[PDB]
């Protein structure tokens with residue numbers, strides 16, 4: 001019993017965190033095999049940040065300009081290349097602690113663990129979701145750039161995020177491990193703002209099925225809804241549209257609890273209308289949207305209470 | 306910016322998790338040097354001296370990854386079983402066994418079959434239970450904090466209570482709370498809110514730019530404690546006020562000044578507003594967690 005925002009064990013990722021220094025800029029890198037991956041803005045000198053020409057800044061650099069530190073050992077840079085917004089530093093030592101891994105690009109609504117690091121040293125781990133506006137509501141301070149997001153289903157680490165910047169609203173933007181940003185963001189200190197955020201509907205529904213599995217049904221009603229009527233109501237509360245794919249994905253949880261997806265949609269419609277009236281669901285007074293259908297199946301029991 | 310429930314990096318602890326099997330019971334163990342620590346109920350009103358005397362070393366199967374460790378000795382310390390093994394753990398970190406107080410927080414590495422599956426942050430409730438997330442097979446999962454390079458082990462999971470909350474011991478086998486390690490009529494006591502932690506989280510909201518709950522008023526410690534008793538909040542002591550000094554100095558808001566904001570939130574609610582993305586007053590972040598997350602401390 002119980003339902004926590006659970007992160008994956010960070011050990012496999014801790015053994016990959018290094019410190020990357022270029023002139024006066026220090027940030028974090030990810031050392032996998034003989035390559036260190038880091039945000040390309042490590043070559044920028046703050047003023048450069050307004051309109052940097054990365055190709056022009058990189059051509060002026062040599063291998064020995066990049067200092068890479070793994071614990072108390074300096075790694076020797078023997079090559080460098082840029083791939084989109086990521087700098088790839090070829091080093092002379094393959095990481096002996098390199099886990100089995102993949103680079104995966106995630107979609108909005110997906111969750112992942114974040115290993116927040118400063119000076120190549122991990123300081124904390126937390127659970128996150130890619131928001132529909134492609135930002136993440138993380139906890140990052142100056143020096144956290146290059147911190148990574150990941151999932152560890154089986155013994156394979158899937159790296160999905162690298163931290164690059166904080167927007168004016170306190171939310172965070174970054175890239176996949178191939179250097180492609182999530183969202184319409186640029187690694188430029190230009191006037192950039194996160195788009196209006198929406199609630200991840202499929203995740204709120206998954207969390208409602210998790211509340212039912214843990215023994216709570218106070219929020220259910222005798223009504224059902226069509227998918228169209230549900231979406232017309234949900235859009236008024238700034239909820240993401242629910243698609244037929246989302247309904248399909250909720251099938252296993254619907255079968256485990258005996259509550260049809262559109263019947264759970266009718267409970268959600270009513271929760272949006274009524275609020276909770278002094279009650280909580282899984283210890284929360286708000287509708288939680290940072291647990292996917294897959295996270296609920298992973299954490300919750302296979303036997304409902 | 307941002308404020309998350311953050312756990313310590315679990316790597317140093319992952320390298321200590323093993324699977325312990327005795328008879329039909331399988332649970333988790335903590336392998337430090339040449340000793341595996343696990344709940345004594347792995348041998349199961351139980352008489353643990355009588356059950357243990359009937360066991361030999363070869364009755365305990367200890368698995369570290371895909372390698373079997375050979376048990377060469379065993380002893381009991383309170384509610385923990387200590388299995389002497391023939392191999393010292395090469396991944397043994399620098400560590401201490403510490404007993405924590407209610408209100409203190411720690412990270413939990415939840416495991417099943419000696420394999421870590423998740424990490425989360427939680428607090429020792431005033432009623433000595435932890436509101437964790439554990440399923441059958443989680444017994445022997447451990448709680449810890451990290452101070453520089455040193456892991457301080459503070460909790461070992463033993464059982465789930467009928468309300469879904471959890472009970473366990475320190476690493477010396479002494480239970481937190483009035484619990485016993487046996488399936489009997491046991492219940493969690495009435496819980497209270499950790500006042501010093503709610504105040505720390507209010508200072509964290511101020512540091513992050515959330516100030517709507519601030520007011521011009523102050524209060525005495527006595528008047529604040531009379532209001533806290535009415536709302537099932539733990540009494541605030543002079544020690545708690547002293548501990549909040551650094552956060553009070555960083556924000557310019559006196560502790561009793563913040564207490565007058567908390568009294569208003571208790572007597573009037575949030576009125577459709579949130580604090581750090583929450584509609585409830587959060588009590589599982591200590592003053593030290595707030596200073597650590599709003600500073601950038603690494604391990």
Ligand SMILES: CNC(=O)CN1C[C@@H](C(=O)Nc2cncc3ccccc23)c2cc(Cl)ccc2C1=O
Pocket residue numbers: 041049140141142143144145164165166167186187188189190306
């Ligand atoms: C809040 N930002 C700033 O004051 C200046 N700034 C520096 C840098 C940046 O965001 N770093 C930071 C990353 N994460 C958390 C941060 C918390 C506080 C301060 C800086 C953080 C940056 C990088 C890129 Cl690729 C684009 C823009 C910027 C930028 O605007």
Ligand SMILES: CNC(=O)CN1C[C@@H](C(=O)Nc2cncc3ccccc23)c2cc(Cl)ccc2C1=O
Pocket residue numbers: 001346439440441442443444463464465466467485486487488489
């Ligand atoms: C809810 N548990 C039960 O009905 C049976 N039960 C088994 C066992 C126990 O609580 N284990 C579990 C621990 N954590 C999560 C669990 C989720 C589900 C089931 C079992 C879990 C136990 C150990 C000790 Cl030392 C004392 C009593 C018991 C006990 O009563």
Ligand SMILES: [Cl-]
Pocket residue numbers: 105106107110
């Ligand atoms: Cl995805």
Ligand SMILES: [Cl-]
Pocket residue numbers: 212217257304305
């Ligand atoms: Cl049910």
